[PDB]
Design a binder for this molecule. Sequence first.
Ligand code: NI
Length: 341
Amino acid sequence: TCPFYKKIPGTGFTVDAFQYGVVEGCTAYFLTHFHSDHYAGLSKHFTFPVYCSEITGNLLKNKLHVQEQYIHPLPLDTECIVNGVKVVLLDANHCPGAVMILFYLPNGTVILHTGDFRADPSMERSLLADQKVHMLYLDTTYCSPEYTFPSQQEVIRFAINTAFEAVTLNPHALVVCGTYSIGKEKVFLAIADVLGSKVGMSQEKYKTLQCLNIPEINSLITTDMCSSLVHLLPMMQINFKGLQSHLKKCGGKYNQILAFRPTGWTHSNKFTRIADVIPQTKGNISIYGIPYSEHSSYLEMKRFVQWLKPQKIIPTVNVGTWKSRSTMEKYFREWKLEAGY
Ligand code: NI
């Protein structure tokens, strides 16, 4: 059955709750973003109302084949009424079309559901600042102090300079970027822009990008692999064997590969800075691991919550074991005692 952390008290709403069949009492199902864990269970067979951003609606329609009559897209930063209740969608700074939802309950309680998010200080001057928020449903992915990472901009700068140098040294080098869902598109778009190239990709991946309301998208991407010097492949193929194999397929148009694996955190965040990063190399193929995150670091999450001063926090990630819940509760209490709420 649908857990209490996916239910909004004193409404018939749920959030990211599509895997449990019909939820008893639910009149509207919200979807924060188009990642499979969150949408799991949605298909052309679903016949209840779904509320979401415009981008998330394009994806539901075109990729999942959810029928149009059930898609209710809402604009961002706008007070809207849903089934008698005031809501606002806000940018979550996660992947394209990802939202946080603000719910103003009839009794006067205010609830923020973050979805998946990367906390940023620009969120401190949104509509959130206008009133007290009583309850917070929080993306706790990286809720432990070891989880540090550079800014998105530091990581992009590094990727840009690295790719530019390699292709100026060898104009027959190909650049490859790994991918498994939506998100982290700036990696491959910024590399292609410094090289004066479009991004080449499969038909399925191109169809995904064509849903994302990216300005001038037709000038940035193509299905003609031949004509382009940055290619996208599934993350699973970003290894020496997969990359040599792809290089055979391209028709000796390239004689070297430089590849990027954008990942979350892995244990080497605790010493290395982005400027120290060096690749793994075997022959004419090099692979760089770059920690481009679309989730809050511990420090970014702590700042956001200390500003917001919620009366209660409800975790939405790593809630499956008592040890994790216990550890998270300890950090929430520290934050509260330091900030005085
Ligand atoms: Ni996500």
